[PDB]
Coordinates of C-alpha atoms and ligand atoms in Angstrom, one line a residue:
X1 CA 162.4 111.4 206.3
X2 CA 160.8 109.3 203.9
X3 CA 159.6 106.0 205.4
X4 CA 160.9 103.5 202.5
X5 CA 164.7 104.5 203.9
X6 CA 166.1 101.4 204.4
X7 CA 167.9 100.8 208.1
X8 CA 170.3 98.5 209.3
X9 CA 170.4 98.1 213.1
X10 CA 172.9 95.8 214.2
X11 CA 173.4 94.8 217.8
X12 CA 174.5 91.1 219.7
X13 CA 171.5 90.7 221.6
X14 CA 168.1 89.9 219.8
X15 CA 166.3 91.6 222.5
X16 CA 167.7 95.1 221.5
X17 CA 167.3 94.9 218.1
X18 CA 163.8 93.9 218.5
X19 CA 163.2 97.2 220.4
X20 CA 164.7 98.7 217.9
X21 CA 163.0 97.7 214.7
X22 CA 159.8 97.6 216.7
X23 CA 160.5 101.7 217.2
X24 CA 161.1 101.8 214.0
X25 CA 157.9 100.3 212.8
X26 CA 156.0 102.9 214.8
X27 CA 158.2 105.8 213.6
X28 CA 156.6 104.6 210.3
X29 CA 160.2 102.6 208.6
X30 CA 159.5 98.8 207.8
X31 CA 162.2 98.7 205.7
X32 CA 164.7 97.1 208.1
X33 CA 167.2 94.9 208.8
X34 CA 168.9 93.5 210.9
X35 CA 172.9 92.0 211.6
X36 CA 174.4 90.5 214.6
X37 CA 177.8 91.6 214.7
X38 CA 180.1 94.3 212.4
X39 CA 181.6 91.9 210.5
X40 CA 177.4 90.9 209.9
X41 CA 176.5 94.4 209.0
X42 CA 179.3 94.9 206.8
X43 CA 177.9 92.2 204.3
X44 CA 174.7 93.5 204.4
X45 CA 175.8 96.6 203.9
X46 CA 177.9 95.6 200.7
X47 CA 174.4 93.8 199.6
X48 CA 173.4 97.0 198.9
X49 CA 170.6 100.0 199.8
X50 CA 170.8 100.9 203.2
X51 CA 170.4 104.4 204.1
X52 CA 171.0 104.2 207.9
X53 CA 172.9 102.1 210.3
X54 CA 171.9 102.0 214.2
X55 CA 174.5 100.2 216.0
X56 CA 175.5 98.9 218.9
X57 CA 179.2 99.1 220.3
X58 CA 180.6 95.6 222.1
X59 CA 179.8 92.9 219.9
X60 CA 182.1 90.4 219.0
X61 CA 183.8 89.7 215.3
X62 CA 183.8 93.2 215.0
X63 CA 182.7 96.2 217.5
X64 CA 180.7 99.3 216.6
X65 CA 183.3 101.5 216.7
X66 CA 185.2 99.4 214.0
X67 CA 182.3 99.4 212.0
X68 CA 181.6 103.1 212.4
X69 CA 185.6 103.5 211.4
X70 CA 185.0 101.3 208.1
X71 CA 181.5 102.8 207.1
X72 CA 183.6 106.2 207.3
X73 CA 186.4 105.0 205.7
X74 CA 185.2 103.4 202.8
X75 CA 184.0 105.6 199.7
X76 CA 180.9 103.7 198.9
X77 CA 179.4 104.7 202.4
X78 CA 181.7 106.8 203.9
X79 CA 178.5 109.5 204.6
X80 CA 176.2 106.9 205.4
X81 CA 174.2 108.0 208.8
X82 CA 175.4 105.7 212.0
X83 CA 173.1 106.3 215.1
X84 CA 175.2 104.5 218.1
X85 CA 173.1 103.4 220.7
X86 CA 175.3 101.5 223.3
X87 CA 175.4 100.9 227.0
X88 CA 179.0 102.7 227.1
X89 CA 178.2 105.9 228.8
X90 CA 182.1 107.3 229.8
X91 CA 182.9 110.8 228.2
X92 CA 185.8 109.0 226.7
X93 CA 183.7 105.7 224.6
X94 CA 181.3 109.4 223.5
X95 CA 184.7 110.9 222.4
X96 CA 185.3 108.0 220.9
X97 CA 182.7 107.2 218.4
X98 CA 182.3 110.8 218.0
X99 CA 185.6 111.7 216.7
X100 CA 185.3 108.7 214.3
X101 CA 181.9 110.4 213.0
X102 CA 178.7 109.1 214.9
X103 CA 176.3 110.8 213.6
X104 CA 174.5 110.3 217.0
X105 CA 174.8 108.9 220.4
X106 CA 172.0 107.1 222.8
X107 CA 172.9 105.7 226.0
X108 CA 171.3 102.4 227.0
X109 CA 169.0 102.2 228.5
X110 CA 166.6 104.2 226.4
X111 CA 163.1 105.7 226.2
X112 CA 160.8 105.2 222.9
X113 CA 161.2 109.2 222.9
X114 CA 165.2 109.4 223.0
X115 CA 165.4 107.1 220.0
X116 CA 162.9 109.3 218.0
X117 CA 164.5 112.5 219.0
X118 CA 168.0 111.1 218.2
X119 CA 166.8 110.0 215.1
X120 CA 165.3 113.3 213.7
X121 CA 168.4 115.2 215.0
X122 CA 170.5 113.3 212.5
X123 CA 167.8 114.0 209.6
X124 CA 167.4 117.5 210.1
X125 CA 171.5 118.0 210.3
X126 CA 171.6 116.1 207.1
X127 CA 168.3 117.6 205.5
X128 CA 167.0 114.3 205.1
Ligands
BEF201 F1 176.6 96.2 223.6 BE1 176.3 97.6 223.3 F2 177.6 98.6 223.3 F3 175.2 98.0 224.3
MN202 MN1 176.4 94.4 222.7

């Protein structure tokens, strides 16, 4: 995918999104950011220029599956890719997000390689 695709990787703790953008960086993506909650993403979203969300499930102000349900909803970004990447691991949180259009799924904790395989799984299904 090309490597100036800007992501937006939203989680409560700083620790994960750290991970995160730092897996990122080595994938070859700098242009990141990052938001704290969904109500957080959802301004930066309406700032503008993100091609890809990563995002986390139980935050507060807004959960990931709210924000996965507005991104779909809404007709500016309603294709826009969302890689979840949660500690939720039931059959019925998968369900879930995946009825309301993940375009992904990874299950914390997770290996550099999960992430990267995740990721290109989502660009290849939408020939990015
Ligand atoms: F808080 Be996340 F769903 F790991
Ligand atoms: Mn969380």
């Amino acid at each position: 995918a090309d490597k100036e695709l800007k992501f937006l990787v939203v989680d409560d703790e700083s620790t994960m999104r750290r991970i995160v953008r730092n897996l990122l960086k080595e994938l070859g993506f700098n242009n990141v950011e990052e938001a704290e909650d969904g109500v957080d993403a959802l301004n930066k979203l309406q700032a503008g220029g993100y091609g890809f969300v990563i995002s986390d499930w139980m935050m507060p102000n807004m959960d990931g599956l709210e924000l996965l349900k507005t991104i779909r909803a809404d007709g500016a970004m309603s294709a826009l890719p969302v890689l979840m990447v949660t500690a939720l691991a039931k059959k019925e949180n998968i369900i879930a997000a995946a009825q309301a259009g993940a375009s992904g799924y990874v299950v914390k904790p997770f290996t550099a390689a999960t992430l990267e395989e995740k990721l290109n799984k989502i660009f290849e299904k939408l020939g990015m």
